[model samples]
Structure formats: structure tokens, C-alpha cells
Target: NYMGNPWTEYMAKYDIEEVHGSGIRVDLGEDAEVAGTQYRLPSGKCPVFGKGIIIENSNTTFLTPVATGQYLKDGGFAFPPTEPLMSPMTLDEMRHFYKDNKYVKNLDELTLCSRHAGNMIPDNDKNSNYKYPAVYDDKDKKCHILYIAAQENNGPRYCMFCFRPAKDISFQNYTYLSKNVVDNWEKVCPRKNLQNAKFGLWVDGNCEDIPHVNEFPAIDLFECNKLVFELSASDQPKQYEQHLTDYEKIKEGFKNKNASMIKSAFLPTADRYKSHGKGYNWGNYNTETQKCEIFNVKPTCLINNSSYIATTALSHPIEVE
Candidate 1:
């Protein structure tokens, strides 16, 4: 239980060293890649990495010897209460990880999971529209993630709970199922005759195959602070894609090879977001009248909460450049 052994890392890094061995983790060392540069020299002739300077007077480098970094999960209780902090569960890890972990978190009214983070149709009514999850419940394992889906494609009713979580099921992958599995979905989907519910990965087939009954991607229902929670919002990606359908505009601006022009074009229409209002120019916010502006980019973190967090400033591909 090591690298793919997210379970192992989870146990150790969470400071629950009580479970030190593998029933998990592979290694605890410096990651292969390093940051900073070898020749970076301060004007006072102080350079962290003592490698030879580019020129006697020029100290510059983009790769210096570095220290191992901290794990995102290694933190205390109130320190953002450990969560599933998810990124797109890649297509490669989708099926296999689920197979390996075989995790099953019993579901209930206390949990929340969403196939679409951009929109949680509380409309099971007019009431639950802007509702927040009832205070996080540990007894309820699912943390309302954006990966798992709802029962109906689109309908209306009581609230988020109208869509009960997949409590009774385990292995959920819809990528590469054979016709045999498809035909016998209800039958074979229950790889759970015994509580032997463990995760596994089967990657010998195609990814485009239609998803079946219990084959949803393995999900980790972690929670996040409500601020940069935009990461969990499905709409941000959708909004970007719609604009990118017209990516030709972004391409044209780059034709002249002017990065500034490309940025100007994109920033106005781009779905860029900076959490805690930290990253970009807020000169306009100071009463909206200024001949000039100032920005030190000083982001201050409070006792425990994070401040100037920026999730991917821009994600784009050159269509014609």
C-alpha cells in the first residue's frame, strides 16, 4: 500500500500514525522534481543554491536543490477538517482506483454528492434552492462531491435528498464494460454478495463503452471551505468551454505573439477567479476612481483559513497559434 495506495498516504499523512503499516504507503522522501534555481543570486552576492553563476556576475537558474514539501492532507482537525479535496479523477485512475480501494461510505440525509457541482437542483423545490448541507455529519460518509450523480436526468421535487446517495453499492465504473456485463448489469453489478467490498482496477478494454448501473467512477466525498469552492463548481468549466468554442479569438490574438494582448482579450471574457479577492487588480474596488493603482500582492492568511488561493489562473490551448 504505497503511491497508488492513497489509502496508506491518507493514514500516515493525516497524523494518524497509529495505522503506520500497509493494511498502506510506499515512500516518504523528496519528490523527484525540484523548484528554485541553482544560480539565483541576491544582489548582495547571496545565492541559496551555490552552483556556478551563468556569468561571473550573472547568477540564474530555475532548478535548485530543494526540500521535500508538505502533503496537502497533513494537517490538524480545525485546519480545514481533512477532506477529499478532489481534482478531476483522471480517466486512467477512474476504474482502477475504485477497484483497489473498494471504499463504501454508507449514505443518508446527512450526506451530499453531486454529478454536477455547478447546479444542485434543490428544486425537488422552491425551498431548498439556496440551502447548505445540514451541519456536516460524520455518521454520513458522503460529503456531497461533484462526481456522483443523481437519479433523474432532470426533474423536480423535495430537496437534495430526493436523490439518495449510492449507499448499498460499491464498484462504479462505466468506462470499459463488455456486452456481457451490460446485459447482466443488475446481476453482476452486485460484486457485493459478501461485505468483501474492496476497490479494484480493470483496464484491459475501451473507455468509450456506455456506463452501466453500478459503474460510476470511484468517488471521494471530501469537503472544502465555501470560498474557493469554485473548484467544485461544475459551471465554471462549462462556462469556459462555451467561450472556448470560440477559441479562435484567443488564437488570433496570439498570432502577433503578444502575450499581453492575448491576456487582455481573455481576462475580460475569461472565467478567471481568484479566491479571497487576492490575485488580480482590485484598484477599481477602492471607490472605482483612480488615475493610478498599487498592488503589493501581499496575501495574509488568518489563524487557520487560507487567503489568496488561486486555482488555475487560465487553462487554454492554442487553436490556431
Candidate 2:
């Protein structure tokens, strides 16, 4: 599904020589010949008569045309060539192509050669599969390491870390949760309680003074109970402070519990997760829903009754860069 402009329009400038004797001969490398495949050179030259072609400037020998054709039939190459005698352009040309064209540049120009050309065989026909030799060097074989740590409300929740081989570098997911609790009701009194107090005081005070006197006083006391409770509770404001401290301790305990759960579930298999070569697997918190979500290629639960659920949709592969 990936499409981009050609690396260079000049590639189309060359014509595929026909089956006639006038066509240029190509020299595939000895490594290629041993692998039973022939690779065409940019010059479109092929050896006329030899066990294999001698690669220019390199000691390697290449497969003959007969060997190339046989390998092609054996699924050594799956796709058909766009042009019969086409060869890859030089790295400098490819770089220029990326710089000159916006489309090619956006396709992760630096890594394109590695992703495509590194694994290319002589018979690879797709333009996207063409790769440069420099991309296959040992330097590209180095691995990439990623470390992840997560915290919620400025406090640590769980820290998950992992690494992947260079060839596998791509988008990754990491999530953290704040351990602080949101006190939604602390700032607002219940409207129903206020209305009930107002109605009872008004109705009882206006009723008959006989039997109503005692009832009205009780209603008044009931109306004042909330105020009295607030006053009594305020006598030791430090108690509320201690309660808040305890709440935070409990929150931290919960965080530690969740962290332990995540470590038990994910850390032991860190290598397996990296090698999965698919989507991310981690726990995430959703503040709006007040739940924790565990995401992977498919969704699963790691914590029950968590405040938030986190899940990730399939993401596009990372660009070549």
C-alpha cells in the first residue's frame, strides 16, 4: 500500500535491451552466483561467456544469466521486474532524488535504502524494494535501545523499559498514571440537601404551634445539623490534614500494588515483548474515564476495576528514518 515517486526520473531514461545479441551483459557477484542468482549492474552489462561475471572493483563473482533465470523460476524472486534491464542508482543519486522530490523525501529517505535494499535479491522487481549497498553495512546492524519510566501526579506508578534491534526500530507506547486522588465533592454541597432543609424549616415554622412546636424545633435542629457537623468537624482542622495524609499513603500503596502487578505481568517477558514485532504492550490510565487500560495488538486487562482503561489502535509502521 506504500507508494512514492521514483528515486530519480533518470531511471526511466534507460531502456531494457531486448533478447537480441545487441543487449548489454551484466556481471553478478560470486556471492550471488553461489546463491544461484544474478544481479544486474547499473551499466546493464552482462558477461558474454564465463562461469560468472567478475564484479568491477570487488573480488566477488556473480551468477550467469542461466542461473538467474533458473532462480527466478524457483521463487528466489517473487515479484516481476518493472523494467527488464533496470539497476539501482547510486546512493548519491538516490540522496539527490530524495532531496529534489518532496514525496521521496517524506518516505524516510535516510532509511529507505536500508529497509528495502538491505534484503534485496537480484530478482526483486518492486521499486520500493530497491536498496543501496551502503545500507547493508555492519553499522546498520547495531541495535536501538529504549528506556521507559512512568509517574502519576508527580509520583512514580510503574516504570517499564525495553529495547529492540536496529532493524526493528519503530513507534512504541509507554504510559504513566498520577497517584493523586481527585476530590470532586469537597468543594460543592449537595443541592438536594440544601432544598430539603429549606422546605422543612419553612413548612414546620408556619404550621400550628401546638403539636407543631416540638416538630418545628426538631425540623430546625435537623436543618442546623449540617452546620453543627461542619463546625464540630472544623474544631481540629489538623485531623483533616492527617486524613489527607493517610489518603495519600493509601494512594501510594495502591500505586505500589499496581506497579507490582505490572512488573509481574510485563517485566519478566521484556525480551518477548520486544521480539513480538507487533504493537505495544503496556498499561495506560484514562483520566476522563478514571480507569486503567492494558493495550497490545489486542486489548486485555491487567488490573480489575482500574480508574481508567487504556488501549491502542493499530498504528502505521514508523517511517524509514
Candidate 3:
């Protein structure tokens, strides 16, 4: 498993460690010379997967000073979290962590192991759920920095799970912080698996606005998807553009008959809109008017109320820049 010992061992060996307040400098060897003639040779590039530097000091509890400082200096850090947190996971902690979450809540030993093994290995598959982990790369093909936690279920331990782009995964990245840093880091970060947890689906944020599988057809099969509806229905121009781009992808998927995979995965369009009404209205000037018009159409009873006729007016355009 990419998250296992072999990988961690590789990380431990390759990962350079630095002491606090210590100045560390790296210098590439001089260019090679052939027959006393200097020639420029290709220099070794750091391995994206295994190359990590860990800094440890009695005064510092985190290894992110280097990365964090760089991120801040480059303007990569924004909407800072309330507290500081660490990324790299230690081996023993990883083991204890998985053990806490892996046990079947109410199953007996025989049943539990059997069920777990069954789930671990799918039909006709011997080594189940034991797959190599893939490193994350951005659109620019730059490998995103990551941290791993080594975990094991039976026998020798392996990587049970890992996290990537560490800072981005924290609630603090989104400006949400806990009362106490030490307690929150221990209690919150470990218990949650941000990668697997669907976002934008039921609420807002990176995962927000992502409709479930079933919700795909209504959004895609029709001329426009939920994103398009969202874009057109709201006044947030930037968000509309983002959703418009997403809708194009959904349309492409629909053309390829991939809409079926999205079934039952999301609530219907109306429900999502209803549930996130406030967010939908955020910065939505047009939507507010439309909502007011909808409310104005409420039922009113009157017997032969010819005097209460409603008139609609259309005005000619007035151009202004």
C-alpha cells in the first residue's frame, strides 16, 4: 500500500530533518568536466513522492514552518484558520488512529472479521482495499505537497490513509477555528477524512453546489444543469461563470451517457435551492427581485373583483455605461 511502511520508511530515510533556528542550505555539485572541458549536466530533481523535509525542535511542535512561511510569503495562505496545526503523521499515532475507527461497532469477532475481510476484498479479488495511493498534482502538473499516516489492520502495518495539500484540508484554511489549538488539532483533524467527505453537494464550499448523482439528469438532461440554473437564477457573476463551466462538463458527461452514475447522489434542484436559500441569495440582486415577485403571486380570493386588475408594463431600454 502506498500508505504503508515501505513508503513511510522511504519517507523517513529521504525526508531531511532540520533543527529549529538552524540555517540549512543546499548546494548542487559543480558541473561535470570531460577532458578538462566543463560541460553542463542535468542536475537531480527532488523526487516528488518521497522527498519531504521534517523539522523538529523542542520549542516547535510543527514541521510546517518552512512550507507555511513560503506559502504565506507567496500569498498562497489566505483566510487563515484560527489556530496552528500540523500535517505530518507519526507511525504509532497512525496505527492507534485506524484501530480506533476500524472496529465494527456491534459485530462479534467472527462476524466482524469475516465482514471486514469481505469488504476489504471484493469478489474474486484476493488483496482487497489494498491499493496504492496516488499523489496529487495541480493543473500545472506540480505535485502538491502531502503528509501520510501509517496504519495497519492485521499483521505488519501499512499506510491506512494519507492527506494531501495539508493546509487546504483544514477548517482553519476556511477561517473556522476551535477554542483551543492542541485539543482541536487532536480531536477534529484526525476524526474527519476531508477527501472522502463530499462537499458542495449538500452545502457550500469546495464541495458545495455539487449535485448528487440523481440530480444530474434534471440538471443535465434538460437544456441546462443545476449549475446553469444556479448561475441564471443568481446574481453572483463570478459564481455563475464557475457553474457555467461546470455545467459544460456535465453536458459532456451526459452526451457520453455518464449521467446514470450520478443517480440518488444528490437532492433534487428545488430542495437544494430551498435548503441553501440564503446562500443562493448572497450577493444575488436579481434573485431577490425574482423571489419578491414569486411571493407577490400568492393566492388572493375576491368575488368579481374587476376593479383589482393587475397590469404588467414593459419599458424601453435605456443605455448607460
Candidate 4:
């Protein structure tokens, strides 16, 4: 009962004072310190883990790009009544969030909200499935686009975070919907908010590319769940556009459901992918582990041990093909 949440030890640890009515309302004040100053995440932007910074009337840094309004994403989880976010989003977009357990994703992160509102739900458990709207997960916390990308670090790769699903409404399409299908999950997986979201607040959000994504700090890598990239029969392609297009079409073809797309014209396209090889590798340089590791494969030279394993190509590597 010390703090009511699992992660508050840090809050108590970093307290500037101990008089917070709540378990602890740690304060870094206008300026504070971190692992050094202005801690940057692996993404290298945003995530400058520090205290608050108050400046004059500002924050509209990314305007010239004529924001299509469709690609905007908001962080801080303070939307709806928040008028600034109102113009870019629609009535239904705000409704889905205010009504359904939609938008409240674990934005400020840390476990503050859970502890703050655990005993009550809007009207004392009489309302709300979520602690708050769009407020959800980050690690075991995930989404389909990134999920698929991670699966095929090399196989069926595309411009990262590509969605190929049944986007039934204009709002859903824009928000980038998501779902965390965890097993034995009782009430509802907290990631319910993590499943669907978008970039309606991007430039204004002044966030990094994916907007507030790296905020939750990330968890285990290459862990198996509903969507690991273990496909059958890999007829890989060299042309990236053809490769991404073919794989996307094929992947969605087999699934019973997909991300909702209101207009056909704006759906995902291979042409949008970068010129670089769409294929990726199975491993990454782990910072914590201090080593390299590959997933879902074992070394074997089955040509009567006559040939060596080499990555001359991707998806289905060829020994002498």
C-alpha cells in the first residue's frame, strides 16, 4: 500500500518534497536532472527525460507541411475537452474516445493514473472500462503494424508501421487502431488503447516521428506472441515495391479482419516505401545485453555438410539456389 502502484518506488525516490497528498507527487520543478542532462531515448528525439520547461507563446514548429490532418497524432493523453486537438479530429473521433474505451493510452506513462484512479471509474466504477481514454500500454503493449514489421525483420518488410486492415470509419483510419490480444487477460488488457491511434497531433505535438512512442521505454525484444514472423514457404522477391505489395496483399488476404480504411485511395502502398532494400535483418545490437543475437533460427549445413551458410539473399536464404 506504500504507493498503490508497482512503479512508484522511483517517484518516492525522486521526490523533491514528501508532502504530496497522493502517495507521492515527485517534482523536478522548472528544470531538473536525469542520467546526465536532457536524457534522449534510443530514438534520439523527444524523450528528453527532464522537468518542465515554460516558454512564451510557442509550440507550432511543424506547420509548413500542410498537415493532411489525417496523419496527426497527439500525446500527453489529454484530448477531447482539450480544444486544440478538437479542430484536427472529428465529432465521432472524440465520441469514440469519450464513450468507448478508446483513446486513453498510457501517455505520461509510469503507473500514476492506475494508482490514482484504481478504486474509481469515472463515477465510482459505475462508468468506464478503461482507467481513462486512449490510456494504455507500451511493451507487452503493442500494435499490428509494428508487430508485423518486427515479425519479418527481413521477410515481408515495408515502410515501417504500414497498416493493411479494414478501416471502416474516417476516424479509425486516421488514428491507427491497435489491439493487444493477451491470454487469460481478465477485465481487459490495458493495451486496449495501444491498439488504435494516429498522428492528428504530430507537428503540434512536437513529438518524434511516431509521436510519444518511445515514452514507455520499451520492453523484451523478439518475444513470441500472437504475431511473430514465422511464415510458411518464403518465395522472397528482390524488387522492394513488388515485395512489400505482394506480401501485404497476401498477408491480409488470409486474415479474417484488418485495419479499417475509409477510402481506398489512401490505403498502404509499396510505392511509399524507402528506396533502401525493404528486407531487414533478424538481429540488432542490444545495448543492455552488450552482444548480438538472432531469432527463430539455428545454424545448419544440411548439404551433407558440404556447403556453408551465407546470407546472399533474404526471406528464404539460398545455399546454392
Q: Against the true structure, what is every candidate's RMSD?
A: 27.8, 31.5, 28.1, 22.6
Instruction: Give the alpha carbon lDDT tens digit for every residue of 1-321 in model 4.
Output: 233333233223111112111100011111111212221001100111111111112232111111232332211112212233332233334334345343343222322222222222322235333222122223223111111111121224443223221112121111111121112221211111111111111132232122111111112221211011122112222234434443343322111113421122333333222112111112221224323223322111111111111110111111112
- TM-score versus the correct structure, for each prediction: 0.13, 0.17, 0.15, 0.19
Q: lDDT of each structure?
A: 0.17, 0.20, 0.18, 0.20
Regions of model 4 farther than 4 Å from truth: 1-177, 183-261, 265-289, 297-321
Instruction: Score candidate 2 by lDDT.
Output: 0.20
- How do the residues 1-321 of candidate 1 rate in per-residue lDDT, one tens digit apiece? 122322333222111112111000000100111011110000100000011111111221111111123321221111121134332223233334344433312211111121112123322333322221111112222222211111111113222111111111111111111101122222212111111111121223211211221111111111111111112111111122223222322221111111121123332322221011122211101112211121212111111112211111110000010
lDDT of 3: 0.18
lDDT of 3 by residue, 146-262 (tens): 211111111122111111111121111111111111222222111111111111211211222223211212211111111222221111112212332323222211111112221
| Model 2 segments more than 4 A misplaced | 1-94, 97-284, 287-292, 295-321
Q: Please, what's the RMSD in Å of model 1?
A: 27.8
Higher-lDDT candidate of 1 and 4: 4
Best by TM-score: 4
- Give the better candidate number (1 or 2) by TM-score: 2
- Comparing 1 and 3 on lDDT, the stronger one: 3
lDDT of 4 at 285: 19
Model 2 scores worst on lDDT over the 10 consecutive residues at 173-182
